[PDB]
Amino acid sequence: TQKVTPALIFAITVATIGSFQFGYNTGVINAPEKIIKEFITKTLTDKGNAPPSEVLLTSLWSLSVAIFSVGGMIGSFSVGLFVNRFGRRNSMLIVNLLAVTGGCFMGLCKVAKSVEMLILGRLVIGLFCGLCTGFVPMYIGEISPTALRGAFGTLNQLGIVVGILVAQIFGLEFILGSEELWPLLLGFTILPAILQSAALPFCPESPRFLLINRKEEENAKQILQRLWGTQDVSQDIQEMKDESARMSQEKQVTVLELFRVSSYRQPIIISIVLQLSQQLSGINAVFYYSTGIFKDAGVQEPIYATIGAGVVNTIFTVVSLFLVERAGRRTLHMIGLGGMAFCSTLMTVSLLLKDNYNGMSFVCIGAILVFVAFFEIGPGPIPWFIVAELFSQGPRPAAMAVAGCSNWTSNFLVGLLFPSAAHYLGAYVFIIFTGFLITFLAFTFFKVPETRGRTFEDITRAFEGQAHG
């Protein structure tokens, strides 16, 4: 009875612009490293100072890159401050002031000759993207029909990887990745923010937020009826009234409370672990260093191979989308972790043997592409939307603040620790990721419940049922 209306597509698509922003700002900074380091050097000396040492330049560059994650840690953790006060839709509209501000700091830092503005820009756009990674799956999770909640939740990741791909393409030297236009490469982030801000007033508020948080049952029902193209929404409305009664009977949920309450501990531990399984897969280490590895394996044009990876990244997100309601979250997440374990292992083996057996070069190239395919089969999309599935209305903002922050914090740690680990371990460094992949494969199989097609009420009651034992 519930259809996919133009209204629903529009509301979800508009939400995923935030996803695009996350992906774009993640990937964009990589291509113009040399150019930006030149800018940093030219700025220091133009201001009278001595030219920076290679160490200082590296430090200032690493800061420009990493400060984005720091902002993301802060932003993701702060989503609880917004979504209950302003609502989900209005939160997304409001924080675009951050996107535009951040983008202007980056777009203007060069002409302003300000390394500080660049760093500040990346911090602010980090804050924005961190809020987005929380806002978007929360919104999509609360407006999607139950039977398509996973598929629609995968559109979040799809926007992210399209963001990354567009970032890679713009980053080409004959596009925006030149010494003249790189401020525009960074400042581009303002355009999606302007577009999304114009469209967001015409998106509905979460009917779940309206009914359960604001006790506006009639408003919620009318929204549902339009969004899903049917007058008959009694099943969903009554589920929401059930959640409303629950929320009124439970204390206001805090972050610390999630680790205290047995009923909350199981899903938050699952939520957190599943974020680590995404980041501690090594996906961002692999993707970033793919260019160097491709080159070392003999790819004559390693940049085009890395764009090829980004294309593979996109194609298999779409595959996940058409498979997550049929196969379920468990199966897809486990296939991806397992397949990535195979490939990261194969990266180590091929890299160890390629100088003695040159055919292993091609295996190394293949292992990277296939790794990326396995990543988007499950561990890419699922952890971003599944946290919204594991909680009822009351705990969900605080949980997604905590989970989201754990996702950002672990990507920070990987960025921070991988180069040192790579230095000492060489090719063996990927066995570290293999270890995490295998550990989380076991965790998933044994500890992660199937959430496909189930109401939040069922899932929550099951967790409570287990907590009663």
Ligand X SMILES: C=CCCCCCCCCCO[C@@H]1[C@@H](O)[C@@H](O)O[C@H](CO)[C@H]1O
Decide whether 61 or 86 has the Cβ nearer to ligand X: 61
Other CB atoms within 10 A of residue 90 CB = 16
Q: Tell whether residue 164 is a contact of ligand X (CB under 6 A).
A: yes
CB-based contact 290:299 (threshold 8 Å):
no
CB 20, min distance to ligand X, A: 11
Burial of 180 (0-12, 13-18, 19+ CB in 10 A): exposed
User: Scanning the structure block, which residue is given the tokens 């989900």?
Assistant: 88
Which of the listed partners (ligand OLC, ligand X, none) does 99 bind, with a CB threshold of 5 to 8 Å by partner kind? Answer: none
- Indicate the DSSP class of residue 427: G
Q: Tell whether residue 30 is a contact of ligand OLC (CB under 6 A).
A: yes
Dihedral, CA atoms, 367, 417, 439, 135, nearest 10 degrees? -90
- Indicate the DSSP class of residue 148: G
CB-based contact 400:298 (threshold 8 Å):
no
Decide whether 360 or 368 has the Cβ nearer to ligand X: 368
CB 294, min distance to ligand X, A: 17
CB-based contact 165:20 (threshold 8 Å):
no
Q: Tell whether residue 183 is a contact of ligand X (CB under 6 A).
A: no
Q: Is 313 annotated as a binding residue?
A: yes
Q: Which of 119, 121, 152, 103 is nearest to 4 (CA)?
A: 152
CA-to-CA distance for 170 and 161, rounded, in angstroms?
Answer: 14
Q: Tell whether residue 161 is a contact of ligand X (CB under 6 A).
A: yes
Q: Tell whether residue 71 is a contact of ligand X (CB under 6 A).
A: no
Residues in CB range of 331: below 8 A, 6 or more apart: 378
CA-to-CA distance for 273 and 407, rounded, in angstroms?
Answer: 9
Two structure tokens written together for 36: 């930006």
Other CB atoms within 10 A of residue 73 CB = 22
Decide whether 101 or 313 has the Cβ nearer to ligand X: 313
Applying CB under 6 A, the span of 118-126, 154-162, 212-220, 223-231 interacting with ligand OLC comes to 154-162
Q: Tell whether residue 415 is a contact of ligand X (CB under 6 A).
A: yes
Q: Tell whether residue 411 is a contact of ligand X (CB under 6 A).
A: yes
Residues 366 to 385 in contact with ligand OLC, rule: CB under 6 A: 366, 369-370, 373-374, 377
Residues that bind ligand X (CB under 6 A): 26, 65-66, 68-69, 157, 160-161, 164, 278, 283-284, 313, 380, 411-412, 415-416
Q: Binding site for D-glucose: which residues? A: 157, 278-279, 284, 313, 376, 384
Query: Residues interacting with ligand OLC, by CB under 6 A?
Result: 12-13, 16-17, 20, 26-27, 30-31, 33-34, 65, 155, 158-159, 162, 164, 168, 191-192, 195, 284, 287-288, 291, 306, 323, 327-328, 330-331, 334-335, 338-339, 341-342, 345-346, 349, 357-360, 365-366, 369-370, 373-374, 377, 415, 424, 431-432, 435-436, 439, 445, 450
